[PDB]
DNA sequence: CCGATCCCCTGGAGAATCCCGGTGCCGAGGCCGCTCAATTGGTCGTAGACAGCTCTAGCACCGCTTAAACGCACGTACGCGCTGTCCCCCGCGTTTTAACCGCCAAGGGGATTACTCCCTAGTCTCCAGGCACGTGTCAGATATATACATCCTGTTCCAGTG
DNA sequence: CACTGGAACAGGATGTATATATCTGACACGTGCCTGGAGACTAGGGAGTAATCCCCTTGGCGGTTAAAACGCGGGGGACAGCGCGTACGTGCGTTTAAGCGGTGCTAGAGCTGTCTACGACCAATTGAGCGGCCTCGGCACCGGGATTCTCCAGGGGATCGG
């Protein structure tokens, strides 16, 4: 049975950052664990606005407002430009 | 060692006017969220109208820009030293304008 | 009517709401109070 | 506070730009001050500028200095949390390509 | 020669009767004014509701109440009966806030 | 605008520190604990008051209520109970 | 006979005594066995409290019997 | 037509797909905006980078070529906000920071 | 001159109902001028030497510690 | 024929439906069974019920008829079990439960 | 416009407990946060689980083990023995 | 039955985890004081993790479970799953 | 021979360069096999649940002892005593 | 055998706090209308409980090697009284200042209603992205020798006293 | 001229960082395939927009005190120095059991097929619960005794010197 895993990707974003080093299982894991997390945090965050506002959609707005709420000061400022961003590029294609 | 360099104002002119008056870095400030620099003058009068760079259109701050902007003293310094005269220039129209108002 | 404190085993009187000798506060109908004050 | 325009600079007239043709000299040593790295005694290269204090270092220098420890500016002692305490500055590599090719 | 206490008993007394009671002791119109000081930076023009400076009020009282009891405690374990800084910044380092 | 609000921090006066220590069972007090104090607090509001705007600007409204300031305190661990 | 009492920190403690034998001597008892000021001692059976010049046989105490002891700061 | 991933058309390494499909079967929402997923991609995306080139540093400091938990810890512990963000995780095998308290230090 | 006459005069300065203490002679000899603190060991042992002598007497102290007072 | 309400049939005082609504539409999971509103309501009902016993306690210990969030505070900061449930959660207009460290005091 | 609240059925179970005392309104609004708070709590504990557990349905044994997760020690003991008892009227009934 | 498994936590083992805790002397009692303290902790733990396992209809604990329980209990822990 | 301090700060440093479990592997799981076997009979373990178990408890531990250090240095003494701990776990909020 | 110096005991003046009885006021509790959501009754689709089978990972046991734990002797340095000095909070009286309360007035924006349109759920077909599996090679742990930094004690020199 | 101590220096033992050889198991890459993601297309409801009402927030004015601020005298607690003796670190020799590698067995985790009962969805209906109104009694505030708790002066009592 198939089990998913962000390994590929962290994977990918490595070489991109560092051309020639490499990664092992257990800091593998580290990441996986780490990214699930991170995920799991933001989507509850989200979904507390929205039911808090009587609505029943997370948007890229409600994203924007939980991350801005979790992370703090800089982390969260580039996070936003990276955001805004990969949204715009998106949409206008 | 570098040698003694002999090259245009001209092809260094670009990077060291002011875009909202158009002349050369007087009392230079800096805008720190994109690194932007212009005549202290020039960016105070700006800021106190709208809350964006004038170049790239950034947010300085949400509320109160004036906490965002710092003196760039080594800009000032290289300018003036690129520039030939024009501290004397500026010293001399000081002492101009001083010595009719007291 | 009186109540028995688990405490002190003290016949204490209704209209009371602490136990007169060993001063601890007197529990609920399902869960009754527990060690308190270990000290003597 | 601290930003209120002096009686002069209420109305400071612009400095005229030369459109002059002429050539400016300079000696190895005359922006030493303005372009030597606080850390590497050399040259800039990459320049990073911190947001706190405006002063100019090496990306690689500055990130070692970092990362080894006394996480405050080498220069003015003013800590900086991280990297992105930090900017690239285009404006000043683009002035010292030019001046020093 | 008129009445004097000696160092102590008005101390316990204040303690005995700021224990039993239950209302604010900062007082609304320095802590509404504060509250706008520090909310001044983020927005321009906010308006507040009456009951959210109470609750700010209420929230603040505690956990200064919470903080200065777990000071005494250090003052107290450092063989002292007066409070001090020292025991500020160990209980809160100590609890993780610093 | 209304006012460049300053210098408004002191409002806590040293009387009403000593009035907290002493509900938190307080006997000395050094000199230096009012400054200290001050400093505290003012982190707390600083942080709380952030989440609250934060959250009424996400509401696009104009003023802040006691139902975002209880969120606010919920989301930082500090659950207060008696305003909804 | 023997009879018990047992005390607030799990102890227990036993002692000879008599139905002839009075309240002021099993507090000059535990006074002897254990230090523990008669002032200080309130003793409860029955979910009553022994008053000091009265005798075990007054209140129907029986053999091994266990009591209460309870201690107060004076 | 060809088809072309979104995650390439937003330009990022991460899967928008199954971000989103994950948004879905979460029960977070009754409903999931379509720009939603590109956001929380990014973020992830670049949070993950900034941590791997902490990590990748420290690897090349302590001369060797694979980031291990060691490496992955310094990373974030030495620096102030990732140390805020993960100030309740415990990272396997990764150690405590080399501290000394001052006053142990024989004078 | 040797420590004895300036401890003499240290002890004969107050002459108070109590002898004086020993950070009270560390004062005056500070005071007077003098190195006390490289010669701890130098006062202790005077001290040693001036009680054992029987000049001055120790007052409540033991050893080093407590107040002093003259014959 | 005649409606009889849940809360009726199980022999409880909590609204069993309203429960049954709330779980429905508070996206907790895409189905909900028959039973766990039933449970639920009588887990809340106990809880208010000895939180109510042990205030209305407090509150005729002082003489008074009324219960007030300072018999709340006390009751709750005096059961142990209460209080380690409730141990991160503000009570307004609570104070503080007195006690004075034996040190401080005079002997 | 209407706003629901637990504020009655509060009162029922004071008049069941303590005949002869009030609440004020504090105090109601006090043991309505109470409420909603444990509410959502055991609600969270339980659809957790039913993740975890890769179900779909919320039940009743859910809630006993959230209940049993949540509560400490004789509270625990006693709210299961509640649960159990109003669960078995309702199906027997 | 298991008995005296306790002191099978040994005073060199307090002693190295004191020593990377950056703790120059120690005394004679904070062993026993560690040992208890570290019974409570996995009492905890462990009824947590067990309540886990027997909602799971099986009867081997995992290291899944174990991770859920920590993760309740504040102590989120990485690299073992989840 | 050395002074008292100097092996103490030599292993402070050793144990401190170093990433490896402390505490004996046997022991440890037959002692979390001892306090499981009151909750439920019959049961088994998973290796990797013994080895997160383990990590847990060591990490908690390590953090303890930090905190008890700071308040013993605190109270102006240089040896750990058991009223440190109490303190630091009061302050923690954990009794 | 009396001064006088410190130590323990008691009474009474003085301030704080509890207990009782009066008085007034506002919000707690009970009643009336209505309206919207919880009940009852039916149908339909699939979620999961049950039974069967497979294979894997957990438990139990053996023997050997050697690293770690235990017990003991010995010295030393650190914790814990004990004393003494001095300075800095505490209690209190007098001046001053701004918080509270009551009252008014303006208008800003929060909350509600009606309309509409375009954004996302749902369904079908199609295909390539990623996952399990296999395999080769070098990153790295271990073993061994060596040079440098720390630490400790014995001796030596220069400055005090008798 | 003959004692002491306190600062200074040098060699030996120890530990740790540095330089090579090795051999090996885990990492990185290639392959087949199948399930999940992408492309088209339809429908209906949620959210954006415009208009309106009136609830509540902001701002200003005057008195009345209650609290805050300032200065003074003094006692008690914080801090520094000193001595003692006991617990703790260090090193050695002996005992214990943990870690390794291997075997054998089987209880139980995990996957698959089926089928039935349980929960969602929809209509008609009616009664519980929310909003508004009002009124009377518990509680807040007042004043006067009565009671408890501090604090200091006067007084016996043991003791050294004379
Ligand atoms: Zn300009
Ligand atoms: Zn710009
Ligand atoms: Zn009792
Ligand atoms: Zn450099
Ligand atoms: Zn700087």
Redo the contacts between chains.
């Keep these: 049975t198939r089990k998913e895993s962000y390994a590929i990707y962290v994977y990918k974003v490595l070489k991109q950052v560092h051309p020639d080093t490499g990664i092992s299982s257990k800091a593998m894991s580290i990441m996986n664990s780490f990214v699930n997390d991170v995920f799991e945090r933001i989507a509850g965050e989200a979904s507390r606005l929205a039911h808090y506002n009587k609505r029943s959609t997370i948007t890229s707005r409600e994203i924007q407002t939980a991350v801005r709420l979790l992370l703090p ?3 969260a ?2 996070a936003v430009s990276e955001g805004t961003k990969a949204v715009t590029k998106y949409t206008s294609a | ?13 670009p ?1 060291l ?1 002011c875009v909202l ?4 870095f ?1 009392d230079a400030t ?1 805008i ?1 969220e994109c ?1 932007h ?1 212009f005549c ?2 020039c960016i ?1 009068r700006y800021l106190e109208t709208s809350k964006y760079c004038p170049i790239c259109d950034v947010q300085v701050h949400k509320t109160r820009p ?1 906490l965002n ?2 003196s ?1 003293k ?1 800009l000032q ?2 300018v003036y ?4 005269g ?1 501290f004397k ?2 010293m001399k ?2 002492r101009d ?2 010595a009719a ?1 007291p | 009517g009186f109540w028995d404190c688990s405490v002190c085993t003290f016949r204490n009187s209704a209209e009371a709401f602490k136990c007169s000798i060993c001063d601890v506060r007197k529990g609920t109908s399902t869960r009754k109070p527990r060690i308190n004050s270990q000290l003597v | 506070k601290t ?1 209120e ?1 002096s ?3 209420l109305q ?8 002059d ?8 040593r ?2 030493h001050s ?1 372009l030597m790295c606080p850390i590497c005694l050399d040259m800039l290269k990459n320049t990073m ?1 911190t ?1 706190e ?2 002063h ?1 270092f090496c990306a690689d220098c500055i ?1 070692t200095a970092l ?1 080894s420890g006394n ?1 405050e500016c080498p220069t003015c002692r003013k800590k900086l ?2 990297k ?2 930090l ?1 690239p ?1 285009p ?1 000043f590599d ?2 010292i390509s ?3 090719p | 020669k008129p009445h004097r206490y000696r160092p102590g008993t008005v101390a316990l007394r204040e303690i005995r009767r700021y224990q039993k009671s239950t209302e604010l002791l900062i007082r609304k119109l320095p802590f509404q004014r504060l509250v706008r000081e520090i909310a001044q930076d983020f927005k321009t023009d906010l308006r507040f509701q009456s009951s959210a400076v109470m609750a700010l009020q209420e929230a603040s009282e505690a956990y200064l109440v919470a903080l200065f009891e777990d000071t005494n405690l250090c003052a107290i374990h450092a063989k002292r009966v007066t409070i001090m800084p020292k025991d500020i910044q160990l209980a809160r380092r100590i609890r993780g806030e610093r | 605008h209304r006012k460049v609000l300053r210098d408004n921090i002191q409002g806590i006066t040293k009387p009403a520190i000593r009035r907290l220590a002493r509900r938190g069972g307080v006997k000395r007090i050094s000199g230096l604990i009012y400054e200290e104090t001050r400093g505290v607090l003012k982190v707390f509001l600083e942080n709380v008051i952030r989440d609250a705007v934060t959250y009424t600007e996400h509401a696009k409204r104009k003023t802040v209520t006691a139902m975002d300031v209880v969120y606010a305190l919920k989301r930082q661990g500090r659950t207060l109970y008696g305003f909804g | 006979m023997q009879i018990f009492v047992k005390t607030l920190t799990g102890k227990t403690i036993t002692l000879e005594v008599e139905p002839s034998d009075t309240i002021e001597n099993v507090k000059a008892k535990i006074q002897d066995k254990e230090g523990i000021p008669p002032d200080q001692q309130r003793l409860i059976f029955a979910g009553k409290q022994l008053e000091d010049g009265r005798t075990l046989s007054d209140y129907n105490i029986q053999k091994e019997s266990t009591l209460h002891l309870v201690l107060r700061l004076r | 037509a060809k088809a072309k991933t979104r995650s390439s058309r937003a330009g990022l390494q991460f899967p928008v797909g199954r971000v989103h499909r994950l948004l879905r079967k979460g029960n977070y929402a009754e409903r999931v905006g379509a720009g939603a997923p590109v956001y929380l991609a990014a973020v992830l995306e670049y949070l993950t980078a900034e941590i791997l080139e902490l990590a990748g ?2 690897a090349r ?1 302590n001369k060797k070529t694979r980031i291990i938990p060691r490496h992955l810890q310094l990373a974030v512990r ?4 990732l140390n805020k963000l993960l100030g309740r995780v415990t990272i396997a095998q990764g150690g405590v920071l080399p501290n000394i308290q001052s006053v142990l230090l024989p004078c | 001159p040797p420590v004895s006459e300036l401890i003499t005069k240290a002890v004969a300065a107050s002459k108070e109902r109590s002898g004086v203490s020993l950070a009270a002679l560390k004062k005056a000899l500070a005071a007077a001028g003098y190195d006390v603190e490289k010669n701890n060991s130098r006062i202790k042992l005077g001290l040693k030497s001036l009680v054992s002598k029987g000049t001055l007497v120790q007052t409540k102290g033991t050893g080093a510690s407590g107040s002093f007072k003259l014959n």
Aim: charge should be positive; aromatic fraction near 6%; hydrophobic fraction near 35%.
């Design positions: 000061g800089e982390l400022k580039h | 060692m570098h040698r003694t360099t002999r090259i245009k104002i001209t092809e260094l002119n990077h006017m008056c158009g002349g050369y007087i800096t720190i690194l620099s202290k003058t105070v004036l902007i710092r760039d080594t310094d290289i030293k690129l520039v030939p024009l220039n500026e129209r000081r304008f001083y108002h | 930003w325009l009686l002069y600079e400071r007239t612009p400095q005229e730009a030369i459109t043709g002429l050539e400016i000299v300079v000696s190895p005359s922006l303005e500028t947001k204090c405006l100019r990130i990362r996480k949390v991280s992105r305490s900017r500055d404006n683009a002035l030019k001046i020093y | 540093n420290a400091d030495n620096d102030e906000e």
